Design an enzyme around this catalytic site. Structure first.
Site, PDB file in Angstrom:
ATOM      1  N   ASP A  98       0.872  -1.157   0.000  1.00 23.67           N
ATOM      2  CA  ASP A  98       0.000   0.000   0.000  1.00 23.67           C
ATOM      3  C   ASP A  98       0.920   1.221   0.000  1.00 23.67           C
ATOM      4  O   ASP A  98       1.543   1.523   0.991  1.00 23.67           O
ATOM      5  CB  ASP A  98      -0.881  -0.042   1.249  1.00 23.67           C
ATOM      6  CG  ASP A  98      -1.765   1.207   1.432  1.00 23.67           C
ATOM      7  OD1 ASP A  98      -1.772   2.115   0.579  1.00 23.67           O
ATOM      8  OD2 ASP A  98      -2.494   1.233   2.467  1.00 23.67           O
TER       9      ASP A  98
ATOM     10  N   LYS B 243       2.599  11.297  -4.001  1.00 23.27           N
ATOM     11  CA  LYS B 243       1.437  10.663  -4.674  1.00 23.27           C
ATOM     12  C   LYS B 243       0.444  11.659  -5.286  1.00 23.27           C
ATOM     13  O   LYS B 243      -0.328  11.298  -6.199  1.00 23.27           O
ATOM     14  CB  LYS B 243       0.703   9.757  -3.689  1.00 23.27           C
ATOM     15  CG  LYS B 243      -0.361   8.860  -4.284  1.00 23.27           C
ATOM     16  CD  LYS B 243      -0.760   7.819  -3.265  1.00 23.27           C
ATOM     17  CE  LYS B 243      -2.005   7.072  -3.638  1.00 23.27           C
ATOM     18  NZ  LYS B 243      -2.344   6.119  -2.558  1.00 23.27           N
TER      19      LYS B 243
ATOM     20  N   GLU C 185      -7.030   0.253  -4.558  1.00 19.74           N
ATOM     21  CA  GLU C 185      -7.089   0.282  -3.070  1.00 19.74           C
ATOM     22  C   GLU C 185      -8.380  -0.279  -2.456  1.00 19.74           C
ATOM     23  O   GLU C 185      -8.314  -1.135  -1.603  1.00 19.74           O
ATOM     24  CB  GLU C 185      -6.811   1.703  -2.551  1.00 19.74           C
ATOM     25  CG  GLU C 185      -5.323   2.044  -2.622  1.00 19.74           C
ATOM     26  CD  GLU C 185      -4.992   3.529  -2.516  1.00 19.74           C
ATOM     27  OE1 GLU C 185      -5.828   4.307  -2.029  1.00 19.74           O
ATOM     28  OE2 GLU C 185      -3.862   3.908  -2.926  1.00 19.74           O
TER      29      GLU C 185
ATOM     30  N   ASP D 195     -12.802   5.183   3.073  1.00 23.81           N
ATOM     31  CA  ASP D 195     -11.340   5.247   3.243  1.00 23.81           C
ATOM     32  C   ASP D 195     -10.876   6.636   3.666  1.00 23.81           C
ATOM     33  O   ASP D 195     -10.722   7.532   2.850  1.00 23.81           O
ATOM     34  CB  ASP D 195     -10.657   4.822   1.935  1.00 23.81           C
ATOM     35  CG  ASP D 195      -9.149   4.732   2.048  1.00 23.81           C
ATOM     36  OD1 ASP D 195      -8.534   5.451   2.887  1.00 23.81           O
ATOM     37  OD2 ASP D 195      -8.553   3.904   1.291  1.00 23.81           O
TER      38      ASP D 195
END
Ligand SMILES: Nc1ncnc2c1ncn2[C@H]1C[C@H](O)[C@@H](COP(=O)(O)OP(=O)(O)OP(=O)(O)O)O1
Length: 378
Positions: A9, A71, A172, A195
């Site tokens: 992850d 990211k 994800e 999330d």
């Protein structure tokens, strides 16, 4: 021979690595004993490159040389509106090179986002190698469901730089559902993945049909996460300190960093206690700081932010042509979902349905990545 494939992850704020070992998925503690690692790189005036916890916790008068949130930039071109907005708010230099965003720091050097992500991947690889007692060459890496082709390829390119053949890029929310075994069930279900990460909030509606996933709809808030809850508490204590003492501590970068660290720790403590002490020796101009934060005050300070998480859920249901009662499983991802108030709001939104958290929400994505990686191992 691809050897033992790991699942990573690669997160905006934190990253996590898991692996099948001796017939069981293991989420791996790093050398500091933590099963998540900040996606942080710090470039020292001496010269040594710090990655992870050592980077995030370094006290520094020059925070512009600490890199994080790569990211946000990976796989994007310079004039992507997302880039143009993020360069306003990131505290390190992001500059245009060859019509793409690069990160510039004093180590001076400019780094592609994939180069920063490669350093994070290297740290996660090393973490797995120490646990496995062997070299790792291949991985499955997760990305947000909304990532496009370029962002997926750039993530694989980060892998290559780190000495990893990224064999699969997987979504994800899908990985989190796989952790709960939802891929190994007969029939059709609707899964809502909620999330709430360190810097981003992603809601996804997945359908699962005899092992096959479809991401039907996604929503959320690209700039809402755990760190925003810390900042609310920060602002509270900076304001209280100025009231009590007359001093504005924001003048001293190291003082703010010390406070942030203790605030993060207190916030976590408040998921299992109703109050927590924040104590800092020589906080500002040689004076000690000691204050208590109650869970009630923490909640009050963030109630608008917590409540704002519900509207994206409603939007994903609408976009998936589903009602609340059509949701078969709610899967919580991110450590912020351990906050009692958030769990309460989610349960109440779904009229009492218990949202699943029996797998650590900070580890579930890596866990599913590892499950998928197990099938590829030589
Ligand atoms: N991002 C977060 N925001 C709020 N609370 C959090 C966050 N992350 C973790 N917590 C809370 C949940 C727990 O009360 C506590 C410890 O979480 P965690 O590090 O995941 O360890 P753990 O629950 O698995 O226990 P242990 O590692 O000691 O066995 O912090």
């Amino acid at each position: 021979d691809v050897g033992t494939v790991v699942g990573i992850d690669l997160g905006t704020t934190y990253s996590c690595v898991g692996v099948f070992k001796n017939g069981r998925v293991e989420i791996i503690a790093n050398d500091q004993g933590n099963r998540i690692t900040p996606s942080y790189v710090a470039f020292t005036p001496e010269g040594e490159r710090l990655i992870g916890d050592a980077a995030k916790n370094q006290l520094t008068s020059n925070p512009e040389n600490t890199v994080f949130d790569a990211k946000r930039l990976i796989g994007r071109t310079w004039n992507d509106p997302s880039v143009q907005q993020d360069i306003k708010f990131l505290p390190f230099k992001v500059v245009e090179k060859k019509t793409k965003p690069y990160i510039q720091v004093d180590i001076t050097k400019t780094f592609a986002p994939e180069e920063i992500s490669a350093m994070v991947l290297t740290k996660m690889k090393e973490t797995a190698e120490a646990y496995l007692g062997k070299k790792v060459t291949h991985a499955v890496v997760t990305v947000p469901a909304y990532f496009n082709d370029a962002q997926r390829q750039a993530t694989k390119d980060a892998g290559t730089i780190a000495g990893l053949n990224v064999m699969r890029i997987i979504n994800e929310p899908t990985a989190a559902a796989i952790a709960y075994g939802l891929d190994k069930r007969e029939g059709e279900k609707n899964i809502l993945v909620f999330d709430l990460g360190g810097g981003t909030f992603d809601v996804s509606l997945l359908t699962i049909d005899n092992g096959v996933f479809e991401v039907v709809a996604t929503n959320g808030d690209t700039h809402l996460g755990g760190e925003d809850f810390d900042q609310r508490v920060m602002e509270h204590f900076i304001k209280l300190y100025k009231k009590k003492t007359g001093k504005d501590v924001r003048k001293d970068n190291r003082a703010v960093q010390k406070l942030r660290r203790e605030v993060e720790k207190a916030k976590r403590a408040l998921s299992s206690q109703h109050q927590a002490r924040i104590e800092i020796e020589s906080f500002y101009e040689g004076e000690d700081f000691s204050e208590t934060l109650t869970r009630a005050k923490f909640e009050e300070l963030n109630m608008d932010l917590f409540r704002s998480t519900m509207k994206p859920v409603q939007k994903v249901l609408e976009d998936s042509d589903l009602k609340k009662s059509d949701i078969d499983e709610i899967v919580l991802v991110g450590g912020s979902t351990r906050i009692p108030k958030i769990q309460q709001l989610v349960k109440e939104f779904f009229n009492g349905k218990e949202p699943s958290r029996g797998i650590n929400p900070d580890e579930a994505v890596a866990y599913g990545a590892a499950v998928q990686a197990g099938v590829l191992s030589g």
